Amino acid sequence: SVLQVLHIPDERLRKVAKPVEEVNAEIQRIVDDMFETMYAEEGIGLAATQVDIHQRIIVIDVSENRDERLVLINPELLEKSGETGIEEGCLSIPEQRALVPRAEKVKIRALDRDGKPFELEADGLLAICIQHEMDHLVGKLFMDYLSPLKQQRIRQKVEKLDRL
Ligand SMILES: [Zn+2]
After folding, report:
1. What are the residue numbers of the active site?
2. Less packed terminus of the chain by CB within 10 Å, N or C?
């Protein structure tokens, strides 16, 4: 069911997620509830923190359709390398796009929604995306890598839309 995605001025967005002790049916309900909200909100990746569930659960799908669903439960960063930047956005940060320093390649390990351990070697957009989401699980926002002046402007610009 489409859940409410928290927007910028919200401390809940700055909460560090607590691990999934056991991926059970309830967890799998969540995973699915997320993918719906991501598709509804028309996003490419979403972290549990943005919908208030404070656990290390991340859903992604960088494919054109709804084909390649990617589930990251308890992700662990194994490697990084290189640097790149995309003018990226966030569903919790309405309409504000910005370039941010990111790794070029990244190697992770996590559990799928079945609870099985897997390993990924994302590069390119998928890398940029996994990195962006994982930050969420530690309450870290992309706008955090900006100058205080820009954070102010962003935050400020976003608020007006929220009252509208
Ligand atoms: Zn985001």
Report:
1. 133
2. C
